[PDB]
Amino acid sequence: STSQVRQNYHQDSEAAINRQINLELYASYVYLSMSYYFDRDDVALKNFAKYFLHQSHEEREHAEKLMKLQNQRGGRIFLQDIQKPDCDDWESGLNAMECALHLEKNVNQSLLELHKLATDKNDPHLCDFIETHYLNEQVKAIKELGDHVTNLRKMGAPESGLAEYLFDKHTLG
Amino acid sequence: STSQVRQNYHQDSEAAINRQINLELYASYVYLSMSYYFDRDDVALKNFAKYFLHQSHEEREHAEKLMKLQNQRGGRIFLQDIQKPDCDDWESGLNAMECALHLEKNVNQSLLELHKLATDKNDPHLCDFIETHYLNEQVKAIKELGDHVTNLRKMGAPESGLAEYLFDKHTLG
Amino acid sequence: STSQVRQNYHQDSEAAINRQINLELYASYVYLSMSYYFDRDDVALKNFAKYFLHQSHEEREHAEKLMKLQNQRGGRIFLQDIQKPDCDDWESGLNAMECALHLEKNVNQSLLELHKLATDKNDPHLCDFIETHYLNEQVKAIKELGDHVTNLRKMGAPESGLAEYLFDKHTLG
Amino acid sequence: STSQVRQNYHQDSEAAINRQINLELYASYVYLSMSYYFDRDDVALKNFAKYFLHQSHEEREHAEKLMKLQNQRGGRIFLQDIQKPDCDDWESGLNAMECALHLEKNVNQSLLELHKLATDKNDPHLCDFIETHYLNEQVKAIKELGDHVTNLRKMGAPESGLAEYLFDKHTLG
Amino acid sequence: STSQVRQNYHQDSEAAINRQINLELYASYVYLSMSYYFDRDDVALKNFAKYFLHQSHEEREHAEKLMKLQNQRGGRIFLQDIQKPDCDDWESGLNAMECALHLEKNVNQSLLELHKLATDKNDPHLCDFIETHYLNEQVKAIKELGDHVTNLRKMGAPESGLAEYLFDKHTLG
Amino acid sequence: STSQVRQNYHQDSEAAINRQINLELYASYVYLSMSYYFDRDDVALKNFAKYFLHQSHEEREHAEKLMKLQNQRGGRIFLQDIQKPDCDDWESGLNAMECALHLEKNVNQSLLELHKLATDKNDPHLCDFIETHYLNEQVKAIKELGDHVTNLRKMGAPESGLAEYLFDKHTLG
Ligand code: NA
Ligand code: NA
Ligand code: NA
Ligand code: NA
Ligand code: NA
Ligand code: NA
């Protein structure tokens, strides 16, 4: 049953990777939902839509890299259902950016737990993988989303509809 | 509540589109699963892996086009959970191609039902959308998968391991 | 006696680096041996020969990078005899790939021990060096060799002489 | 008061980053001082001057990267006075290179303490940042300065004025 | 003790140049502080950040040119501590621009005093240096900052958060 | 047991080739050792290091050409341990060049014995191989090393540290 390639790869690490795959796929689905909210005729913020669609595709790439890792290490991928997002209607550009920030911080927390597990199981390859490919990407994403939230709030969103319009044009365009 | 853009778009059509979105996303997940099966060190068929990953990405594009349609017509997207695929281990190149063929025929059946609904609701735009973007793509996919299954069977798959190897190289490479 | 550059570099780490240098040079010699086995007129698998010669040269580069590290840190290189490989005749493409896989896993185990030592001696530079330059390279090598072994076995090697021929052409060519 | 972006970032880490910023800015000032010493009409070693000015600019870049990190993590930058360098007159090319080596080793020691703190506070992002951007740069700098000191000493500096002249031309030019 | 190059260069002029070096380095530090304030996640004005960072680098260049002058004339550079800026938190784009304007006027006043000293000591080279390299640069800087302050005030800064956003985009971008 | 290709290839010749392979690999290891001696922070002669590393790689190529010959003729390669070099510390550029000259003359003597054996066994192909690929290369190498030794001695090495520095720059650079 043990893979010919497997070396220094704990069952707990393998399980945590499978959980992370699901979380990344979930995040991709959330961003997809947000994207198409902004594409609605009654919302009509094209650059918000583009921004979130890009994020969706990036999360899918992150999931696929974890799947690749699992196989590289001789673990076995077990997929689970991808839960639907928490909202159908994301309310506003500001509300979506705030929800994105919350999601990114949740993903980051999971990655930090995975890193801790890798370190505890003396799996330096896995720890390095997470550091190299995931942790700075998350810090950057969180900082960007925080910047966006700050700007939208300062401009008068979400009650000032001119604010979201201009942010869409000048920041996200 | 009715969208400013909505015209000649039945509630039943809107609901059927939402179901089709889920089915396309499901198909994408199935193909993703198959892809990474072929990437396993104990399977190691890189061009099978590439083939299925391409299919996964294509299905996601199909889902996104339906989401775009929903918004174009003034319907509202309601996402559902994406169910996990039926298998974790796809057994062989031949078995995966057979499962893909079955999936594609199921997707095609759903599209034919959607077309019938559009025609019944006198929605020519929707009927044309399905014909133009979906039905020939499905016929082509089904024909290709059938061709692949035929070739693999004729070559001696899945018991002849040389067969899958050579198919991977010469057909899928 | 202490180098002007030396800082946070334990004697145990210095000794472990010297051992690793020898192991890399040994691995280079093994791969060289395998290469020229495949060049024999009674074996005659040119792409196996090329594959192993490339690996030989890569291992030598790995050894030289460790020598560079030793000097960068102010340690002192002490070379030892390079032991001859365990075989003169490597039997088959499959047997050589299996022996390579075993060797790579042994090298990886040594690197993981070196990383553990670096972490225990609070030498983050050394730990990072190993992670950055060695550990993912080893995981990739192990995965590749496992893939090769799987394919050769599935094709009917080493009793099916057509298998090795075709693998040589299509995978290694 | 807590930043919206802040996650897994200890107050002690934030404080240590602020100290490191000051130390990098200090090092920049030292190198600036050395540069302009070599530009004196009674010293007149242009390539020594260029070498140290480059180092000055590099240290400033290092400080700015730490400031960027502080903000990325949601810490708050607190600047302090930049102390004047220990010397106004650096005596000789050899003496300056020796002083530079001492400075670089002091900076490295501070970075190693920061890495230890990050590891103790289970802050893998910060630890990785230091490893990736700072620790190998310091090892390289220390090795280069040691090489320069060795060459100058071997050539007969600082009593052989021809030595510094020729080193300036052939090594630093 | 007197430099071989020294001619018509008064001790008072030499001392004033040393003071000016410190003031330029101080101004560089102020602008650096302002830059990174605008990079905060709770401020998030990237083009303000860029503007001030550019100014920081320009002030450092100004300091280095004075150091070059000192050596050209046979004076001796004596560096002093670089005092920390007066604020850690610069409040707003408008407040920072106002603080910059005040700083630039203070630097200009010091340069005008230096010019007066040069003229009083019959040092035409020094007077010309200041006129050529410093005085028009200061007048231009002051005019630019005044223009920026006027525009920000007219737009409704700092209470109108849309004002700073749009200024950042359209003037500073 | 006799190779299908073997013709006019004496067992004594086959054995001598195996010995020569080992000697070339030994020489490669010696040069590698010397290279990294010059890379030490307390030696710091980069062009000496480069020179010897080049020689190391050339000797490995020479060994591989002999391995190719062995297989071309239907002999069988038998590898032996590669002995460690006689020194860990090579003392000086001059001492290393003198040791290299001694090594090259020893290698040449072995090649001349191999040529004599080939001629005695009426093996013109082998004799021609040695003449064409080895003997002029050795004469050239010996002449070059002798030239280097002469120049270093004339310049005042190894007691004049300026000599080795300048030789490193002007001859080896
Ligand atoms: Na992600
Ligand atoms: Na589809
Ligand atoms: Na290696
Ligand atoms: Na630095
Ligand atoms: Na200035
Ligand atoms: Na040779």
Side-chain angles (χ1 to χ4, degrees), chain F residues 46-98 100-126 128-166:
Chain F
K46 293 170 83 86
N47 294 316
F48 279 85
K50 287 183 173 47
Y51 178 80
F52 291 125
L53 192 60
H54 180 257
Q55 301 313 319
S56 181
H57 294 167
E58 289 287 283
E59 292 300 316
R60 175 181 81 163
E61 285 256 40
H62 296 164
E64 290 176 3
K65 186 178 253 286
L66 290 161
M67 293 172 79
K68 178 182 173 75
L69 180 282
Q70 189 75 287
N71 283 337
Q72 282 178 308
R73 297 297 299 279
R76 295 290 167 250
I77 300 159
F78 286 95
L79 297 174
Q80 300 300 158
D81 297 348
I82 310 163
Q83 297 296 302
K84 71 179 189 163
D86 283 337
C87 298
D88 307 304
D89 178 320
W90 296 96
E91 302 176 36
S92 69
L94 175 57
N95 182 253
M97 288 288 181
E98 292 174 328
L101 176 60
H102 183 94
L103 175 64
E104 289 293 354
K105 293 187 89 185
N106 178 268
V107 172
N108 195 39
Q109 189 56 55
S110 177
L111 288 162
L112 293 170
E113 294 161 354
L114 225 184
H115 192 279
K116 179 174 274 286
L117 179 62
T119 305
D120 288 352
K121 298 310 186 185
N122 299 113
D123 190 337
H125 174 268
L126 179 57
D128 183 63
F129 174 87
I130 296 304
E131 289 160 17
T132 301
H133 296 113
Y134 295 78
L135 296 184
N136 193 233
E137 288 314 304
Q138 281 314 101
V139 161
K140 289 181 301 177
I142 293 160
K143 177 63 164 60
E144 177 173 288
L145 287 162
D147 296 349
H148 293 342
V149 168
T150 292
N151 278 282
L152 283 162
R153 288 182 176 143
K154 285 183 178 312
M155 290 168 80
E159 78 95 279
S160 168
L162 187 61
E164 299 202 344
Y165 177 87
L166 293 174

Side-chain angles (χ1 to χ4, degrees), chain C residues 28-40:
Chain C
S28 183
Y29 203 21
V30 173
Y31 287 131
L32 178 63
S33 180
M34 291 182 177
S35 180
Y36 283 90
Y37 172 78
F38 292 102
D39 180 65
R40 290 167 52 157

Side-chain angles (χ1 to χ4, degrees), chain B residues 111-126 128-141:
Chain B
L111 288 162
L112 293 170
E113 294 161 354
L114 225 184
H115 192 279
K116 179 174 274 286
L117 179 62
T119 305
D120 288 352
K121 298 310 186 185
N122 299 113
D123 190 337
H125 174 268
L126 179 57
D128 183 63
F129 174 87
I130 296 304
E131 289 160 17
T132 301
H133 296 113
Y134 295 78
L135 296 184
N136 193 233
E137 288 314 304
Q138 281 314 101
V139 161
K140 289 181 301 177

Side-chain angles (χ1 to χ4, degrees), chain A residues 3 8 43 50 61 72 101 121 135-137 144 169:
Chain A
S3 170
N8 196 41
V43 181
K50 287 183 173 47
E61 285 256 40
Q72 282 178 308
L101 176 60
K121 298 310 186 185
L135 296 184
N136 193 233
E137 288 314 304
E144 177 173 288
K169 293 304 189 183

